[PDB]
Amino acid sequence: MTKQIVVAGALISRGTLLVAQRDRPAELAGLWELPGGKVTPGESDADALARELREELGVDVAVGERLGADVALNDAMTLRAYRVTLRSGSPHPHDHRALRWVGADEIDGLAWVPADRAWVPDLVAALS
Ligand SMILES: Cc1c[n+]([C@H]2C[C@H](O)[C@@H](COP(=O)(O)OP(=O)(O)OP(=O)(O)O)O2)c(=O)[nH]c1N
């Protein structure tokens, strides 16, 4: 068996990180994540992530290098983050409850969705 991929983006602008507050499902609603979503059939990781961020945030990004380690979300799925940079737009929460730009001092204490917490040191490092 092979695992489905979920891609997430670490958008850093002016030394701060975009985080996004989920509105669904109930178990994650109110918690914060790196925005992204499931890769659909035929898509590269970059294609999927750029599409998700265009849909969720209304921005065009360039997809860069991996950020941190892959995370086993559950027995079916693997979550991967990439550094992304803003080419065009201001993020807007189409799907999320809220967005926030956070600096290094606000990464550890943020109410992360459980899976994304694994990336805290990587995110702090990328910001420092
Ligand atoms: C983007 C993302 C997603 N995560 C989890 C939440 C879900 O259990 C699964 C899929 O993410 P989701 O954002 O729901 O993907 P969608 O593509 O929007 O899901 P569909 O409703 O299936 O389209 O990954 C997660 O833990 N962290 C994170 N940064």
Side-chain angles (χ1 to χ4, degrees), residues 6-9 22 24-25 28 32-37 39-40 51-52 56 73-74 77 79 95-96 113-116 119:
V6 184
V7 289
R22 292 188 68 102
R24 61 173 195 74
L28 304 180
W32 296 79
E33 67 173 5
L34 300 188
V39 177
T40 69
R51 171 184 54 73
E52 285 288 350
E56 289 188 333
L73 250 173
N74 50 47
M77 304 183 225
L79 179 65
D95 290 342
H96 291 91
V113 296
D116 294 38
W119 298 321

Side-chain angles (χ1 to χ4, degrees), residues 79-82 84-92:
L79 179 65
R80 174 169 284 189
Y82 290 92
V84 305
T85 60
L86 200 45
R87 292 201 314 238
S88 159
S90 287
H92 177 83

